[PDB]
Amino acid sequence: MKLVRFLMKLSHETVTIELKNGTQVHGTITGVDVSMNTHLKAVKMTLKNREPVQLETLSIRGNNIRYFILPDSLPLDTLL
Amino acid sequence: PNHTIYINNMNDKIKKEELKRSLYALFSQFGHVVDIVALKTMKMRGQAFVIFKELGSSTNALRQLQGFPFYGKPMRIQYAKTDSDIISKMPNYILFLNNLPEETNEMMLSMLFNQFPGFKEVRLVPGRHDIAFVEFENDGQAGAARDALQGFKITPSHAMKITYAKK
Amino acid sequence: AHPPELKKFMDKKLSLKLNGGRHVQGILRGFDPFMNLVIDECVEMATSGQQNNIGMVVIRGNSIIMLEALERV
Amino acid sequence: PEELQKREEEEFNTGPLSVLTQSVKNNTQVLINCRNNKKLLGRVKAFDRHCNMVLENVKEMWTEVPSKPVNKDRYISKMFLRGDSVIVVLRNPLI
Amino acid sequence: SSKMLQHIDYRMRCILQDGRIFIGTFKAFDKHMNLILCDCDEFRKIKPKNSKQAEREEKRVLGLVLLRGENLVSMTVEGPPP
Amino acid sequence: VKLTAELIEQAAQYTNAVRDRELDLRGYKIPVIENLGATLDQFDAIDFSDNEIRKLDGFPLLRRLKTLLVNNNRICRIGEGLDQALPCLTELILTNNSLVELGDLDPLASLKSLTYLSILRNPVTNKKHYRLYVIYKVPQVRVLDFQKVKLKERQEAEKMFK
Amino acid sequence: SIGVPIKVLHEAEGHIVTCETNTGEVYRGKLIEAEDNMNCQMSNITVTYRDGRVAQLEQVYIRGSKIRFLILPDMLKNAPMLK
Amino acid sequence: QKVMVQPINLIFRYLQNRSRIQVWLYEQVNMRIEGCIIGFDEYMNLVLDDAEEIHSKTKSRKQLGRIMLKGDNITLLQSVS
Amino acid sequence: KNLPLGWDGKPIPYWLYKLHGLNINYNCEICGNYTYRGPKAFQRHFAEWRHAHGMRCLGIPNTAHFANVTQIEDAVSLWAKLKLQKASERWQPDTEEEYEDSSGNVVNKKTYEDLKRQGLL
RNA sequence: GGAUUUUUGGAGCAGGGAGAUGGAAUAGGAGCUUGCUCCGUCCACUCCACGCAUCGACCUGGUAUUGCAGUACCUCCAGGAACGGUGC
């Protein structure tokens, strides 16, 4: 097993992604595949020294992500 | 005629891209801009072509800009001998064509006669050679292109002129 | 699982750009499907014009993102 | 599948990732060391082969030069981490 | 799933390995997801190196570009489909 | 006749002649300059070939604009807030237009980005010292009547009319 | 499996293309031999090395691992991949 | 036509010689790894002996002994002895 | 159970449903991608309205010659050759009916009257 | 199917020195607000070593070509560096 499958427990889920180019974004992603592929939506994104740039349908990559933040009402053991 | 219009007689110390910007600004008016085929190699320097949406658009940019001042020398624009690769992949009603080729291809003759708002048909007199009679579904169109064709070049070895057919 | 097409270029001269901005001037001599092009008579070229003959460089495609040709082969 | 996940537990437990294995069976708050110099301190809730670890009570700190760098510090309790941005996963920090 | 397969054929700003945004009328995906961006351009920061000079972007167009899989940082939509 | 975002979205936003994003609306006689920003930050040229726009006005905030066709139009004057809505603007081609007097050159100078301009076929053309007024008011200009500007022309245009 | 990306690379090989690599090594020329691993062989190319002295070499072996992008035939816009 | 001389063939002949070479690195052409390789595997993750870091600009050499450098941060080597 | 209607609006029993073979559906592209159950039903539809409309808007009359041709490119190439044949077997006096001028050389009816009434013949 | 070509990453970072040179209205600390002193983020001018070279586009005037073809980019001399990344 992997925690890629734990991040596969995210759809209609309020998350926050700190990506590879100094990025930090709030996002309700669209759908995530086994290789971490989690496409953002209505997301407010800010790379290194940036603005709150908005993407209504965006496709955040895999290995070009760094950190993920799940919902607060998210049971961890039930999500993995 | 052609929708591909030749635009030349300008300076060479001007750039291809810069003269392209000038030509776009000055061509979106008299026609449409589809593509500017510009080569600044030596075999064709100081010249380019703009491929306009309509053949009458290109020849009308040619007849209005018949020597319009620009870029070091008054630029001259005419129709081309043929058309560009984009468009390649894509007073009366009746008038006698005098100096009508016994050699012309009816296809190009049709594109000539239908430069105007669509012509009715062209009838290259097949008896005693060197005559034709062309009718246009729009008589104003016939007279327009026939007056602008008085002395018109097609196969430049002659001038193909069409006047109002007599009584 | 497909070997690379250095086939007519083998035993011929290439001037390669590998990481560190470096250059390896040499003969195409040996490779694997890993593209590890190995250059004998290969010499380094640094940032400065200094160049040292390395004997036989087995230069991994791990870094070398370029290499140009000296002839037609 | 079955014997594979058996060997997988044995691998995460009696191999190199024993630090995170003890963070999971002992509920330790462990220092995941990024390759990008952002120190996150917290537990390990989900962990596997590639160093993919989900950390609870996560607190991220950076050396932020506005000067002499300050410790930019925040604490998002639950948050996941993939093992690519990680350089290390250390069981025990002195704090 | 193939999430982008709905949002393709429109002018989409694909993000770079170095932080550019390139609005190409995206075509298709892969397992590596290497991009084939048609009618595609690029634009990146023209860094003033200063503050009394301001930051802009000079326009570059490749047309149709085959962006190797190591490229994407994101893919958002910046133009509806023409 | 209503010129809407129907004719602005259905407009063609694609590769121009000089390989830039152009949005043509040829064949409408549109006299209404409204509902345009729905080009959605993916456009630099706004073209209204075959238009009857009562004057030069009515554009939205376009910090990107790189060409505009307002030729074959009914341009009589020139509106004010043009620069902050076209800072990237160099090509505002308004030939075959009907500008008349140099008071229609009042907002013409406030742009820092104007270099490729055309107001041809206007009664402001054959007037004496008209290109002089232009070469005075347009500092950063490079393409004027499709032939370069001149430092001699700039000397004349600054020195005269003190 | 097999990539319509690779079909695009095959339709972009053989003629003038313009690859762009990692550190700015951009080679505009005949991208002769590209294998689906993208190690592109270019021929009679003009490559900048991002150096602005974008000089013309012959038969370069520009890997595709560093390839940021690759400007392909503008005539195959109607590809069989997208159609 | 002509047969392949593997890079593993190079590394194997070098190790059989027990020879001292300096090796190149990644994203920093200033430093070189001066030492001898002891053994190998199918992976080409270079293992080394009595190695030292040698700097171009600084001009120093910091020795490790029997060190195990990364496999992906290798580029090539020059046999110095 | 999807059981088709009877006059008294109930399910049709199963052996009878099998006999009538409703399971089989016919993709009629002319009819707005309408799709039909029941084979003779399908067939009569070719003269039913939806097919008639389809035809009119296709630009080709609802004559029998195309009935059971349901794809529209086939229909247009069919009616294409049909058009060619109708124009063939028409006797058109313009190109057929032919006139000698006085000068011992011949033209058609059309050209004869043309140059006749534009002042020579 | 996280090991030398693409998706489990080599990413992060910092702008060379100084002059009784200066701006922080609404924003820094202490000397317990104002006045004034020193202190840990930039730009404008000037001194070095216009941070150093290449090339490309352009502005300047002179200067060669009148020519048909689908473009990385096509004159030559000379100035200036308004702009880009490549080696330190």
mmCIF file of C-alpha atoms in Angstrom, chain B residues 166-167, chain I residues 117-118:
data_model
loop_
_atom_site.group_PDB
_atom_site.id
_atom_site.type_symbol
_atom_site.label_atom_id
_atom_site.label_comp_id
_atom_site.label_asym_id
_atom_site.label_seq_id
_atom_site.Cartn_x
_atom_site.Cartn_y
_atom_site.Cartn_z
ATOM 1 C CA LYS B 166 -24.263 46.965 -78.664
ATOM 2 C CA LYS B 167 -27.951 47.003 -79.583
ATOM 3 C CA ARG I 117 -31.642 38.439 -81.146
ATOM 4 C CA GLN I 118 -28.457 40.254 -80.187
#
